């Protein structure tokens, strides 16, 4: 009998379950509670006393005391499995500094008698469940948004774009404007359940020089939400206002070159000979990429900057907001590849520096 | 000389220092604590506490697919298990049924449709086929599972990923290509139609805006005018080409405060501001600046002629002799149901594209673009676009510059 878990660690939301699955049989936010340890979800309803941590900043782990906490929680709690009897797939950001791939793995083998484990790049795994095994990805969940050129599971180190705008980055510019329309959103809970506007609503037009004129020349784009307090909130030209930021870095000062713009320059960084298919294969990954209406909103802008004789298929899976995790259950349910594992054995003999080779 | 534990202990992967030279190690202190802490009790537990517990090992069932034969490049064997990743749990055979037996879960996900009709996956080489012959099949006649059955050299020795390649790209070789070009049309022809026809309207209803916009025409006329008034005898002319447009901006005024295109704009709005409608009417043209019009067509000639070919195959070859159709290949039970209406819209688009191209080439012939010159054929719109914006820009500059020429006028 046999089994294998897959854990995609992220800035904002941990996301993990088992092998050959449809998605994670568990998910929560990367958050840890310690007094002036209670991790995960029962960590909001425990604010004030325990100050709150985010073991991961922009994709990269920054607090290992806590990070360890999560991986612990993850298993024994939202999985009920207890290591040892399980090979584990962990994930890591493009360009995760060797240092941590070691500190990462160590934690496992040492702290949970994990028999085997491999550490996969976040883009890449994404593009695996899109069928392809080549061409530029746009992972872009909460903390960070990377632009990763790929090619037969092989990312191009010198042509990866890392941009520091994304999830909570946006969940933020919203709260900005909602009160600029006089609202109760400043406090905390009156924020958690407000990124939420963004998730359950919040689309993106195709152009503002043509849709900001549908409430500033109209009154049909509103909508409302039922706040835990009852008092309903009516949202206006909001759903699509913030996400504009990706394309529109500026919105929060962000002097940044934009998401679609980057997929562009990025590619122009790696060789020409692959570009056709790069363009022909824009897979996209979780969070900030799955707002309704960004799929083809991208497509537009990109096909725009891009040449007029270029194939430009711009993918966007069932729920890429699990793209990377999904691909995760694939390259492992996919058995055969099993010769990419690192047995506690191999580890015990060489140690950290082995997670690498 | 060092003391040692009875059971394996949790290793301390450290990075040793080699030369002891003038360190702190070398004075043997290390050796005192050595035995000391051993007799003094200590190590005894340090032993018990960091006892490295055993390590389980399993999987196997999918491991061993390793040991079995494989004539398929890691890449491929891999990019099967990639898209056939939903059929993971199904055995090497369960799955093939579900595929020949064109389920509604397989045909629905193009990822798999597309894959399976990938030239790189279809095309088998002699050098390749050979390797698979001792395990192939013929299905000539065969109308039941158990019939055929001449395994001869057994197929089980191959890696899972290898087997599929066999029972499908090999054993149904003869027709797999067309079988797939068909199932595809089946599954695609729908949207893959609306998609074009619309792509075609964004042309037709911009090429339209140009047809009639007495406005636009007039503006040029106003330029031809000022042109001739400026140009000299040898340079007078009853009409010019679009290639003129882009060099309006260079002609500066005296005090380089004006771009000729400014006056031209100013002039309209203040003598005929009954024409600045072209900058409204003609936007639909901008909505297609980069459209490869010479390949929009061809994509349509591709649509129809593709169907007009799953047709040819149902009758005169490939997709006729239900005999080779591995008993289960429920393609026909699935093709024909739609082959009819499909082809209808196949002849539809044709008509439409006839109706359109000819029209288009006409508007072009007008301004002087030869419907037969790759370049203008497409670089056409862009000059109208370019002009417009160069203009929508001169307009601004002028409408704003005319503001500043009010305050430094009042204050
Ligand atoms: N359903 C949704 N629709 C639109 N946006 C969402 C949705 N869910 C989350 N988001 C936004 O994207 C973020 C989550 O994305 P994801 O889970 O991929 O982040 P992540 O794991 O932190 O990835 P990374 O660490 O690279 O930032 C949320 O914090 C929010 O900003
Ligand atoms: Ca992520």
Which DSSP string do the residues of B37-72 spell out, in sequence order?
HHHTSTHHHHHHHTB---------TTTTTTTSB--S
**Cα–Cα distance between A114 and B57 in angstroms, integer?**
10
With beta carbons less than 8 A apart as the criterion, state whether B243 and B367 touch.
no
**Cα–Cα distance between A81 and A75 in angstroms, integer?**
5
CA angle A107, A110, A114 (to 5 degrees): 90
| Displacement of CA A179 from its chain's centroid (Å) | 28
What is the distance in A from the centroid of ligand 1 to the CA of A93?
A: 14
DSSP A140-167: --SS-EEEE--BSS---GGG-EEE---H
Burial B63-86 (b: 16+ CB within 10 A, else e): eebeeeebbbeeebbbbbbbbbbb
Question: Of B381, B387, B388, B377, whose CA–CA distance to B244 is shortest?
Answer: B387
Consecutive H or E run containing B199 = helix B191-211
Consecutive H or E run containing B297 = helix B293-315
Method for this entry: X-ray
Residue B397 phi, psi dihedral angles, 5° rounding = -35, -45
**Cα–Cα distance between B336 and B409 in angstroms, integer?**
78
**Cross-chain Cβ contact A113/B53 below 8 Å:** yes
Q: Look at residue A88 and give its three-state secondary structure.
A: strand
Residue with tokens 């152009």: A207
**Cα–Cα distance between B390 and B386 in angstroms, integer?**
6
**Cα–Cα distance between B183 and A136 in angstroms, integer?**
29
DSSP B335-352: HTTTHHHHHHHHHHHHHH
Closest Cα to atom 8 of ligand 1: A287
Q: How many CB atoms lie within 10 A of CB B310?
A: 26
The residue count for chain B: 411
Question: Of A334, A316, A331, A332, whose CA–CA distance to A139 is shortest?
Answer: A316
**Rg of chain B taking only CA atoms, in angstroms:** 38
The set of residues, in sequence order, having a beta carbon less than 8 Å from that of B188 and lying 6+ positions away, is B110, B113
Residue B25 tokens, joined: 């190690």
Q: Which of A84, A330, A351 is the closest to B56 by Cβ?
A: A84
Domain boundaries, chain B: 1-62, 63-188, 189-411
In the structure, which protein residues have their CB atom closer than 6 angstroms to any atom of ligand 1? Answer: A 10-13, 59, 139, 141-144, 166-168, 170-171, 195, 198-199, 286-288, 290-291, 321
**Cα–Cα distance between A5 and A89 in angstroms, integer?**
6
The set of residues, in sequence order, having a beta carbon less than 8 Å from that of B391 and lying 6+ positions away, is B261, B264, B265, B279
Question: Of A123, A241, A225, whose CA–CA distance to A171 is shortest?
Answer: A241
**Cα–Cα distance between A65 and A71 in angstroms, integer?**
11
**Cross-chain Cβ contact A352/B13 below 8 Å:** yes
Distances (CA, A) of A19 to A326, B77, B89, B372: 9, 19, 11, 58
With beta carbons less than 8 A apart as the criterion, state whether B182 and B319 touch.
yes
- CATH 3.30.420.40 range(s) for chain A read 1-122+324-357, 123-164+257-323
- CATH 3.90.640.10 range(s) for chain A read 165-256
CATH (residue range B1-62): 6.10.30.50
A1-122+324-357: CATH topology is Nucleotidyltransferase; domain 5 (3.30.420)
Instruction: Please report the sign of the dihedral spanned by the C-alpha atoms of residue B209, residue B214, residue B216, residue B221.
Output: positive
Residue with tokens 């599971």: A153
Residue with tokens 């882009």: B246
> Looking at domain B189-411, which CATH architecture does it have?
Up-down Bundle (1.20)
**Cα–Cα distance between B179 and B331 in angstroms, integer?**
7
Question: Of B341, B348, B338, whose CA–CA distance to B186 is shortest?
Answer: B338
Q: In chain B, which residue's Cα lies nearest the Cα of A340?
A: B63
Our mutation pick for probing the ligand 1 site, out of A6, A8, A11, A12, counting the most ligand atoms within 8 A of Cβ, is: A12
Q: Which residues of B touch A (CB under 8 A)?
A: 10-11, 13, 52-53, 55-63, 65-66, 75, 77-79, 81-83, 85, 88-89, 111-112, 114-115, 159-161, 289-292, 295, 378
Look at strands A145-148 and A137-139 and give their pairing: antiparallel
Sheet with strand A5-8: strands edge to edge? A27-29, A13-18, A5-8, A88-92, A117-121
**Cα–Cα distance between B241 and B369 in angstroms, integer?**
8
Question: Of B185, B80, B173, whose CA–CA distance to B128 is shortest?
Answer: B173
Q: Look at residue B240 and give its three-state secondary structure.
A: coil
Residue with tokens 């996209």: A284
Range list of β-strands (E), chain A: 5-8, 13-18, 27-29, 32-35, 38-39, 50-53, 56-57, 60-61, 88-92, 117-121, 137-139, 145-148, 161-163, 223-226, 232-235, 283-285
| Displacement of CA B294 from its chain's centroid (Å) | 19
With beta carbons less than 8 A apart as the criterion, state whether A137 and A270 touch.
no
> Looking at domain A123-164+257-323, which CATH architecture does it have?
2-Layer Sandwich (3.30)
Residue A226 tokens, joined: 């039922």
Residue B367 tokens, joined: 């301004």
Per DSSP, helices labelled H in chain A are 64-74, 98-111, 122-128, 167-179, 189-199, 244-247, 259-267, 272-280, 295-305, 323-333, 344-350
Q: How many CB atoms lie within 10 A of CB B48?
A: 12
- Ligand lying closest to the C-alpha of residue A91: 2
**Cα–Cα distance between A160 and A148 in angstroms, integer?**
5
* Ligand 1 atom nearest to A286, measured from its CA: 18
Burial (CB < 10 A; 0-12, 13-18, 19+), residue A346, is: middle
Residue A115 tokens, joined: 């028999």
Distances (CA, A) of A96 to A92, A126, A157: 6, 16, 11
With beta carbons less than 8 A apart as the criterion, state whether A40 and A73 touch.
yes
Look at strands A137-139 and A161-163 and give their pairing: unpaired
**Cα–Cα distance between B225 and B227 in angstroms, integer?**
5
**Cross-chain Cβ contact A351/B11 below 8 Å:** yes
The set of residues, in sequence order, having a beta carbon less than 8 Å from that of B66 and lying 6+ positions away, is A336, A338, A339, B159
* Ligand 1 atom nearest to A140, measured from its CA: 26
**Cα–Cα distance between A117 and A352 in angstroms, integer?**
12
Burial A104-138 (b: 16+ CB within 10 A, else e): bbbbbbbebbbbbbbbbbbbbbbbbbbbbbbbbbb
Q: Which residues of A touch B (CB under 8 A)?
A: 1-2, 4, 20, 84-85, 87, 110, 113, 115, 128-133, 152, 303-304, 308-309, 330, 333-339, 343-345, 348, 350-352
CATH class of A165-256: alpha beta
**Cα–Cα distance between A72 and A56 in angstroms, integer?**
15
The tally of CA atoms less than 13 A away on the side-chain side of residue A295 is 11
The set of residues, in sequence order, having a beta carbon less than 8 Å from that of B278 and lying 6+ positions away, is B213, B215, B216, B219, B388
Neighbours of ion ligand 2 (CB under 5 A): A 10, 141
Q: Which of B11, B56, B115 is the closest to A115 by Cβ?
A: B56
**Cross-chain Cβ contact B290/A308 below 8 Å:** yes
**Cα–Cα distance between A188 and A228 in angstroms, integer?**
13
**Rg of chain A taking only CA atoms, in angstroms:** 21
Residue A137 phi, psi dihedral angles, 5° rounding = -110, 160
Residue A61 phi, psi dihedral angles, 5° rounding = -65, 135
């Amino acid at each position: 009998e046999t089994t294998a878990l897959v854990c995609d660690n992220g800035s904002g939301l941990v996301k993990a379950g088992f092998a050959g699955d449809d998605a994670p049989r568990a998910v929560f936010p990367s958050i840890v509670g310690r007094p002036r340890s209670y991790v995960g979800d029962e960590a909001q309803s425990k604010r004030g006393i325990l100050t709150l941590k985010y073991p991961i900043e922009h994709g990269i782990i920054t607090n290992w005391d806590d990070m360890e906490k999560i991986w612990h929680h993850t298993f024994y709690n939202e999985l009920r499995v207890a290591p040892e009897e399980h090979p584990t797939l962990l994930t890591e950001a493009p360009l995760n500094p060797k240092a941590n791939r070691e500190k990462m793995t160590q934690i496992m083998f040492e702290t949970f008698n994990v028999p085997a484990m491999y550490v996969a790049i976040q883009a890449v795994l994404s593009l695996y469940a899109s069928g392809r095994t080549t061409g530029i990805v746009l992972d872009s969940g909460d903390g960070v948004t990377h632009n990763v050129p790929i090619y037969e599971g092989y990312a191009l180190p010198h042509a990866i774009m890392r941009l520091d705008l994304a999830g909570r980055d946006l969940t933020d510019y919203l709260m900005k404007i909602l009160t600029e329309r006089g609202y109760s959103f400043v406090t905390t809970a009156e924020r958690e359940i407000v990124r939420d506007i963004k998730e359950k609503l919040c689309y993106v037009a195709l152009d503002f020089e043509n849709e900001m004129a549908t409430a500033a020349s109209s009154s049909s784009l509103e909508k409302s939400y039922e706040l835990p307090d009852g008092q309903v909130i009516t949202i206006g030209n909001e759903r699509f206002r913030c996400p504009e930021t990706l394309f529109q870095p500026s919105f929060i000062g962000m002097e940044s070159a934009g998401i679609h713009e980057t997929t562009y320059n990025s590619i122009m960084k790696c060789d020409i000979d692959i570009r056709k298919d790069l363009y022909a294969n824009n897979v996209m990954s979780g969070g900030t990429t799955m707002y309704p209406g960004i799929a083809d909103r991208m497509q537009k802008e990109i096909t725009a900057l891009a040449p007029s004789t270029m194939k430009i298929k711009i993918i966007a899976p069932p729920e890429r907001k699990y793209s990377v995790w999904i691909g995760g259950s694939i390259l492992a349910s996919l058995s055969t590849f099993q010769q990419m594992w690192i047995t506690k054995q191999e580890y015990d003999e060489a140690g950290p520096s082995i997670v690498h080779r | 000389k060092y003391p040692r534990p009875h059971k394996k202990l949790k290793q301390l992967h450290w990075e040793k220092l080699d030369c002891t030279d003038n360190s702190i190690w070398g004075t043997g202190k290390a050796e005192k604590f050595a035995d000391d802490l051993y007799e003094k009790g200590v190590l005894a537990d340090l032993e018990k506490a960091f006892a490295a517990r055993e390590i389980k090992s399993l999987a196997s069932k999918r491991k061993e697919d390793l040991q079995k034969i494989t004539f398929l490049s890691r890449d491929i064997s891999q990019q099967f298990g990639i898209n056939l990743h939903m059929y993971s749990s199904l055995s090497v055979a369960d799955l093939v049924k579900k595929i020949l037996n064109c389920d509604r879960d397989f045909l629905q996900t193009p990822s798999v449709v597309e894959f399976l009709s990938k030239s790189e996956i279809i095309e088998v080489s002699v050098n390749l086929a050979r390797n698979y012959a001792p395990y192939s099949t013929d299905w000539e006649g065969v109308r039941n599972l158990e019939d055929a059955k001449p395994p001869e050299k057994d197929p089980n020795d191959l890696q899972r990923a290898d087997q599929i390649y066999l029972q499908l790209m090999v054993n149904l070789e003869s027709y797999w290509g067309s079988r797939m070009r068909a199932l595809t049309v089946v599954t695609s022809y729908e949207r893959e139609y609306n998609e074009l026809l619309a792509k075609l309207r964004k042309v037709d209803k911009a090429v339209s805006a140009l047809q009639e916009s007495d406005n636009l025409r007039n503006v040029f006329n106003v330029i031809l005018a000022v042109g001739n008034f400026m140009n000299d005898t040898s340079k007078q002319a009853q009409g010019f080409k679009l290639s003129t447009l882009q060099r309006l901006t260079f002609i500066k005024d005296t005090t380089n405060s004006m771009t000729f295109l400014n006056y031209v704009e100013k002039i309209v709005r203040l003598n005929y501001p009954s024409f600045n409608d072209f900058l409204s009417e003609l936007e639909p043209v901008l909505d297609v600046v980069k459209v490869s019009i010479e390949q929009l067509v061809n994509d349509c000639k591709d649509f129809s002629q593709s169907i007009v070919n799953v047709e040819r195959s149902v009758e005169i070859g490939n997709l006729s002799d239900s005999s080779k159709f591995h008993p289960l290949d429920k393609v026909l039970i699935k093709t024909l149901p739609v082959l009819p209406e499909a082809r209808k819209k196949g002849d539809l688009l044709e008509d439409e594209v006839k109706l359109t191209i000819m029209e288009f080439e006409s508007l072009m012939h007008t301004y002087g673009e030869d419907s037969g010159d790759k370049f203008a054929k497409i670089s056409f719109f862009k000059k109208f676009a370019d002009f417009i914006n160069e203009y929508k820009k001169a307009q601004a500059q002028n409408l704003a510059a005319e503001e500043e020429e009010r305050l430094y006028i009042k204050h």
